Every structure is written in structure tokens, then in C-alpha cells.
Structure 1
Amino acid sequence: NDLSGKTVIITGGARGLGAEAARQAVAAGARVVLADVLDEEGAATARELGDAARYQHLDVTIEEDWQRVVAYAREEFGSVDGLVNNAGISTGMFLETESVERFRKVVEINLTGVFIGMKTVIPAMKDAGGGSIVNISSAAGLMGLALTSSYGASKWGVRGLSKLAAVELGTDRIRVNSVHPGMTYTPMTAETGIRQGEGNYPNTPMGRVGEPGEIAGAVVKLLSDTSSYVTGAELAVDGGWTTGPTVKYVMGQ
């Protein structure tokens, strides 16, 4: 089913979701390339992953870093079959509050970054007769989420980017889809005081926050050939956060 024999570059794979996806894909047969700004950790992720993994330094906003890392894959593995655009920075504040400078920063990573990744990897995949680009968006890209400011703007952008890219590359067998994670447990969200566990996140239909491995599974599905006719699609992995409001809220929560 969801098996591999390909080379997938994972951006933001030094930690959290990115590493998890790497771990899962390597565990599925793919040879991965981790790319992050977090070097020390990254190589540590690679080193633990095994021989199917290499770590590469990559600043998602620098076209040259992309060009170099994409090239490193073709050389070091023979091809580039998958791209998982995960690297990004978040926002937790009201619109008027956010500085235009920071707005611009966040939008650079989250949006313009996946674009540089796309246009850059596209030729390598054309070279390989098709490929899969999985754009990790957010639940903030599926509905208006209070307090996401620049992050909301950029996750909506990634959703349209995937879609229009999907219609342009279909004939080249280049698949492009977006995955949308809801509240996930990570030491970082743990720092927000987010508790993992059934009953611990009542404001999402499933009453709980998700796990990194849960989102990682859907990334692999879209990397595998079991989804050979899926493109310009959006997959929400949020325990129903974006589907509709919690019952309690429909009454008075």
C-alpha cells in the first residue's frame, strides 16, 4: 500500500512533525533528506534515523540553499521524488498588534518559502517522471483562526499555491496536495500549556489534541503511490476542529 523506493526532501525535519514524517517514511523505505536551520539537532535526527537519511542545512527563503539541497539529493540518491514543505514560524497575536516587519518575516518562510521549494524541485521531478509535493498547511489555512495574523494569511496562501500548482503540473505527473494539522501535541505546544490526552482539548470534536505520528501518517499516504490520482486536494488532520463547532458551543460553551 503506502510503500516507497524514492527520495524525499523534508523541510523543517530537525524536530516535531518534520522529524516524525522522516522517521515514518524511512520506516516505509524512502531515503530522506532533512533540511532545517537547526543544524546540531538536524544531524542528530538524521544520525538516529539511519542510512536512509542525510541532513542538509537549508534556509527556506534562500533560493540558493534550495538549489544546493535539491542538487545534493540528485547526486547523493539519484533522484528527487518527494517534497514535504513543513518549515514555518507561527503567530499568536491579534492583527493590529502584529508588526508589519514580523508579518513580512513570517510570510517569507511560510509562503514564499514553499514556492521557492516548488519551482526548485519541479525540474528534478520532471527529470524523474513525476513526483509528490506535500504542502503542510494548518487548520489556520482552512478557516479564520483568531490570533494567527500573518500565520493565517500564509497558510491560506499555501492552500491556493498547492491548488494552482496542481493544475499546472498534473500532466507532468507532479502531484501537489496540502495537509492541514489541527492542535497537535509537541513540546512547543506543551509550552503553551496544551495537555495531551482524551478529554484534554474539549474544543475539538475528538476532545483531544493530535499526535505528531498521526499527522505523519497522512503525509506518507500522499507520498506513496496509493494516492496516484490525488492532486489539488486538502486533507484535514484535526479531530474535526475545522469541520464545525463543538456540540457544547452549538448550545452555550
Structure 2
Amino acid sequence: MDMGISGKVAVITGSSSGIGLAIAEGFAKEGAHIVLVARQVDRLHEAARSLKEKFGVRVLEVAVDVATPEGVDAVVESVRSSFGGADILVNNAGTGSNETIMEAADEKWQFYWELHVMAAVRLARGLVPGMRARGGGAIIHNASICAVQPLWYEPIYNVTKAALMMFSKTLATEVIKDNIRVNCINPGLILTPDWIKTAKELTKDNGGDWKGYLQSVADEHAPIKRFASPEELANFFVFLCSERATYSVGSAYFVDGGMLKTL
């Protein structure tokens, strides 16, 4: 299936490693030019070169913090000057949380709000004009299964991911007149660096069986009884941003291997 993505400009946040990078690799395969946005400068270099060397696409690096207005502003200016504008926006930047409502500081609630919601909000305000002028395009929000099905230990992640999911929906109705399709992807258990590292830290005192630990999490939560590869998830982002998905508007697509327990 021809995705019709060749030559398009895709800006992806949280893309120095893990899910963000695999999504960027997915677009590169389809001939998309890629704007990588992340905090980690060195990992950004790693990623950009790897994309160039494997796929031969153009890659622009924007090493900023999207949780701040200044950082978002830098992104939009790098995009404007290099390519004119973007055709594809993927809001992937974010991190899990770990707390109780009773003991977490106000500053932390604020932080995730800035990261998960305000970043998508600011990047939309910033990039939509250029996108509007280029004839339209696609925006994707990577929320989480937690936006609908909260995990007990991360209330702030749950709350702010639900806010993101709703934002996606409201944005969708605002910009569709501009031929801009806005959708939302809710991944389940995705085998990331973060997951492996927390598997290392939690088993260091009981024998370091990290694959055994991961397997029991998957057995507990997912009927398919495995984590997904970031590459598997990536496939869905690419297809939803393609000219093969032209009727997808304001929807929430789950990629969770059965983990969602509700209709």
C-alpha cells in the first residue's frame, strides 16, 4: 500500500530514542523528511545520523524542551526556515509518573500539564498556520491506554493524558476545515528503554530476572501476553498520517493487544 508520504515533512517530539525514534524511522522508510525534537542533544545527533545513513531522508535536529513556550517557538522557526512548514505533527513527548494524590507536589501536576497538554496546545498554535498554507496535513497525539483506563500508581499521568486525549478531539473539529486531520493513538505496553530500565531496578535485589518481570506484567495486563515492539506501534502512526487514512478525524485509536478491558 502506497502511503503517499514521500517528500512530506514530519515533526516528531520525544524522538531521540524509544517510541519517538521508531515513529520517525517509520516515516523515514516512507520517504518523509523528518524534524526530530528532543531534550537530549547527543542522542538527537545519534538518531539523526542513523536516519540519514539507513534511509537517506533529510533530517533537521531541534534540541529544545517542548514543555516551555520558548522551546516550542524554536521548533516552529526551525521548521519554517528549513522546510516552510510541516505536513505531519506527532506529539510523542512525555513520561510516566509515580505518586499518590495525597503526597504529590503542585509543581509536579503543573509539570505534566505543561509537558502532555500545553506542548500539544502550543505546537498546534505554532505549526497549524504553516500546515494550513501547505494544503493540509495530519496531527497525532500519543496519549496512552491510561487516558481512558487509569493505572493506580500514576494519577497525574492519567489525568494529563485524559486532558490530552480530549484536546486532540477538540483540535480535530477546529482544524478539519483546513484539511488537517487530528487523531489520537493510545498505546498499551510498548517495550521501551524506560520499561527495561525499571525492570532492571526492580529485580536487582531478587536475582535480576528482568525478562521474567516484564513477562509477568504482560501476563497480568495484556491478553496477547507480550509487550509490543516500538516498530509495531510506529506502523499505526505512519498509516494514520498517510493519504490512505483521509477519513480519520477526531478519533482515538487503541494499540494495546487487548489490554483495554472496556468497549
What does 1:151-170 align with in structure 2 at a 5 Å threshold? 151-170=157-176
Instruction: Return the alpha-carbon distance in structure 1 between the equivalents of residues 72 and 63 of structure 2.
Output: 9
Are 1:211 and 2:213 an aligned pair?
no
**Does the CA-based 8 Å contact 1:79-1:124 persist in structure 2?**
yes
Bigger helix fraction: 2
SS in 2 for 1:176: strand
In 2, the alpha carbon distance for the partners of 1:215 and 1:83 equals 16
CA shift for structure 1 position 185: 0.7
Contact 1:3 1:29 in 2 (8 A): no
2:246 paired residue number: 228
1:118 aligns to what?
A: 124
Q: Are the aligned partners of 1:137 and 1:159 in contact in 2 as well (CA < 8 Å)?
A: yes
* Per-residue deviation, 1:244: 4.2
Distance 2:226 2:23 in 1: 21
User: Which digits, 9 at most, give the CA deviation of each residue in 1:98-131, with x for residues without a partner?
Assistant: 2222121122111111111111111111111111
Residue 2 of structure 1 is matched in structure 2 by 3
In 2, Cα distance between the equivalents of 1:136 and 1:195?
26
1:199 positional shift: 7.5
Amino acid of the structure 2 residue aligned with 1:53: V
The alignment's TM-score, normalised by the length of structure 1, stands at 0.91
Q: Which residue matches 1:248?
A: none
Any gaps of 5 or more consecutive residues in structure 2? 200-209
Q: 2:124 and 2:257 mapped to 1: Cα distance?
A: 29
Contact 1:132 1:175 in 2 (8 A): yes
Distance 1:195 1:118, change over 3 A: farther
1:37 maps to: 39
AA of the residue aligned to 1:100: D
| 1:22 counterpart letter in structure 2 | A
How far is 1:163 from its partner? Answer: 0.4
Aligned positions of 1:31-110 closer than 5 A: 31-50=33-52, 51-110=57-116
**Contact 1:8/1:83 (8 A) holds in 2:** yes
Q: Deviations over 1:189-231 (max 9, x none)?
A: 0122264887771121111111111111111011111111111
SS of the residue corresponding to residue 97 of structure 2 reads coil
Q: 195-204 or 164-173: which moved more?
A: 195-204
Gaps of 5+ in 1: 246-253
SS in 2 for 1:202: helix
Deviation at 1:71, TM superposition (A): 2.5
Q: Residue in 2 aligned with 1:181? A: 187
Q: Distance in 2 between matches of 1:31 and 1:42?
A: 15
Whether contact under 8 Å (1:26, 1:53) holds in the other structure is no
Given that 1:37 and 1:59 are in contact with CA atoms closer than 8 Å, whether structure 2 keeps it comes out as yes
Q: Identity over aligned residues, as a percent?
A: 29
Match of 2:219 among 182, 202, 219: 202
Q: CA-atom RMSD, angstroms?
A: 1.9
Question: Contact between 1:195 and 1:201, CA under 8 Å: does it hold in 2?
Answer: no
Q: Secondary structure at the match of 1:97?
A: coil
Paired residue total: 245
Counterpart CA distance in 1 for 2:193 and 2:10 is 25
Q: Against the structure 1 CA distance between its residues 142 and 72, is the aligned structure 2 distance closer, same or farther, given a 3 Å change threshold?
A: same
So what's the TM-score if we normalise by structure 2?
Answer: 0.87
Range with bigger deviation, 151-160 or 63-72: 63-72
Q: Distance in 1 between matches of 2:216 and 2:69?
A: 44
Q: 1:158 to 1:37 in 2, by over 3 A?
A: same
- Aligned partner letter, 2:96: S
